From Swiss-Prot, chain A:
Coverage span on the entire protein: 161 to 520 of 522
Positions of modified residues ((Microbial infection) Deamidated glutamine): Q271, Q274
Membrane topology, as annotated: Peripheral membrane protein
Motif (Nuclear localization signal): 121-129
Domain of life assignment: Eukaryota
Residue positions, PTM PolyADP-ribosyl aspartic acid: D26
The protein's name in its UniProt record: Cyclic GMP-AMP synthase
Cofactor(s) the protein needs: Mg(2+); Mn(2+); Zn(2+)
Swiss-Prot record, chain B:
Miscellaneous: The cGAS-STING signaling pathway drives sterile inflammation leading to type I interferon immunopathology in severe COVID-19 disease caused by SARS-CoV-2 virus infection. Tissue damages in the lung and skin lesions are caused by activation of the cGAS-STING signaling leading to aberrant inflammation. Endothelial cell damage is also caused by activation of the cGAS-STING pathway: SARS-CoV-2 infection triggers mitochondrial DNA release into the cytosol.
Binding site for Mg(2+): E53, D55, D127
Protein name, entry field: Cyclic GMP-AMP synthase
Outcome when changing C206A: Abolishes stimulation of interferon production
Effect noted on mutating L14N: Strongly reduces enzyme activity and stimulation of interferon production
Amino acid sequence: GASKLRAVLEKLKLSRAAGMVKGVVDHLLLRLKCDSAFRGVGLLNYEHVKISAPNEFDVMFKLEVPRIQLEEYSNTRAYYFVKFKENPLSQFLEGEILSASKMLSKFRKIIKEEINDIDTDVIMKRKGSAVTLLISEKISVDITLALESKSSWPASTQEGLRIQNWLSAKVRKQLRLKPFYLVPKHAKGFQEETWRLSFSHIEKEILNNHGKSKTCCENKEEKCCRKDCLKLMKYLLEQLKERFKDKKHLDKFSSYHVKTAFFHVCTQNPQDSQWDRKDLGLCFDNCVTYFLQCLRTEKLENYFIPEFNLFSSNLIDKRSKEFLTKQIEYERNNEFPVFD
Amino acid sequence: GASKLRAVLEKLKLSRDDVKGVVDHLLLRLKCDSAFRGVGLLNEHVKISAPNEFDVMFKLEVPRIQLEEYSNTRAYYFVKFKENPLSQFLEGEILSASKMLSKFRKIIKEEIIMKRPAVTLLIISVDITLALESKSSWPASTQEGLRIQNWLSAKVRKQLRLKPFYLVPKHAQEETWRLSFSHIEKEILNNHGKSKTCCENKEEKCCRKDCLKLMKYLLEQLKERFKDKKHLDKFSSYHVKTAFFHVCTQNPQDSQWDRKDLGLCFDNCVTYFLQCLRTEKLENYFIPEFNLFSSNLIDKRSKEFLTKQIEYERNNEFPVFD
Ligand SMILES: O=C(O)c1ccc2c3c(ccc(C(=O)O)c13)C(=O)NC2=O
Ligand SMILES: O=C(O)c1ccc2c3c(ccc(C(=O)O)c13)C(=O)NC2=O
Ligand SMILES: [Zn+2]
Ligand SMILES: [Zn+2]
């Protein structure tokens, strides 16, 4: 049944915009770099987090905080407090703690006064992880502020990134030498000054260099279907999320959940021969089945923070998971009509 | 036979089972000079037989450089610039390796047993080499080189080319700098298979590294044997390493390097090296139009001598390995 899938992959392919986004983010950086607190700001990598939203872009603004002290908040292995006029963030302390609210409030207010200078009509949507702009009433851009630390990764990541049997232990050591990032994200009436660990840069490298063989998808003999499986998994969720848009059931589910499950499947199937392009229908069925397992199990560990469960009941209602399960199982049983 | 090569590699590792942070003190006192403030390590032993001799590259970044090729020696270049800490060393618009080495050879003795690769410290021994670092894009002579696309992938080829390249003081004309990629060579060797997990599990154990070790040991032993003769004087472990890289391009798949076939793979490396001698062609792996085996560089009689000696060794189960 791969014919209906690659039909979807061809239709999704013809979304082949950025430039009006580039000019806005470039103008935003030029002004943001004039502030002492945001002097070292810069782009991380335009990224299409949603596969079926060509008018939705996503950028990450990085800003290094040299020599910080991360204090874990109440054993939530992903949320941390940030500790440290030698610090240019001196206007944002709430004691010894970097205030995420104040740091975000100024970041938001600078962009507000900066989208008005532009020729091009830009609107900031109303109000964490941070600001969304509306370029010319058609294209929306989500900007996320990310603290950068070039220090070694927190101890909660020690057992994560289990890519040794797939991308090798040597690659795993190399990626862990790269910096990590912290995004302002409240934690569960919420601790409003916490930051969540972020490895979006590592996730990019893993996706765009994804085979056991270094030449995977570089010749016809080693062409795998890893990327297509993730694309279809994202399209499925987006279609269902939009189909049941005003039932609120699928609100808390996002492409990161689907992307996390896909990484775990990559660990369980480390050989390129398990992802042969002629097996797209089977491979996709196994990806859908595994995601369904995480739903029924209420266990989807963060790929980098294994003790952080993305599908715990404290984060996502069991009813919402049961609803996602029923919808996905109906689709898979009936050859995915939501793709049409 | 094949058991003789495994025995040699076995003795080579006992030879290295049992090193000096002296160099860390050198860069302490060397970084305090104005012209050498951007100094540091780059990463080794060329002589695999005697591990009592080390080799270091002292990297020094040279920001605004424009390279001009010297009479189409696609490896050698004059370094000019486009406040300047090395203003002491200019001989006009070009940068003098003579005065830089002299000042570099002045503080090695000042802040010190030096020996006038620029210097040699006797502790053990370490060959210190001065290298200019350039973060610019590689010269046009490297365009058709690093042919690793069918082996380590085109993607990897693009990542390594973004890394800086280096220039060492090398005679050709006496103020020329030769291209150096000892850092890329290091990565290519310590990350050598088509599979990223090559040599990380018994199922994917290749013999690439051992074929290079035996090739280096074969040349070093023959060079010692005929030391009183001058035939093998200009052959070096870098020639052996370069030939091994081209053999890797020729045999990209890991299945062509199964450690069960050490004898077959090693004979492949010998055969190709032999072919480079008879035809007098051994291109630099990064600079293809630079032939390390040209008749201008090495005597044909010298090549034919090494050819006949290695041919004797291969025909008698390599008694050089006893
Ligand atoms: O789509 C999102 O909101 C989202 C984006 C990125 C990330 C996450 C994470 C957890 C939950 C969500 C979410 O709330 O869905 C999410 C996470 O642990 N690491 C991320 O990098
Ligand atoms: O062993 C050496 O002398 C040596 C070391 C390193 C290099 C070279 C090169 C050419 C010739 C020799 C040599 O003359 O043998 C050599 C070269 O093109 N690139 C090198 O990186
Ligand atoms: Zn692939
Ligand atoms: Zn190997």
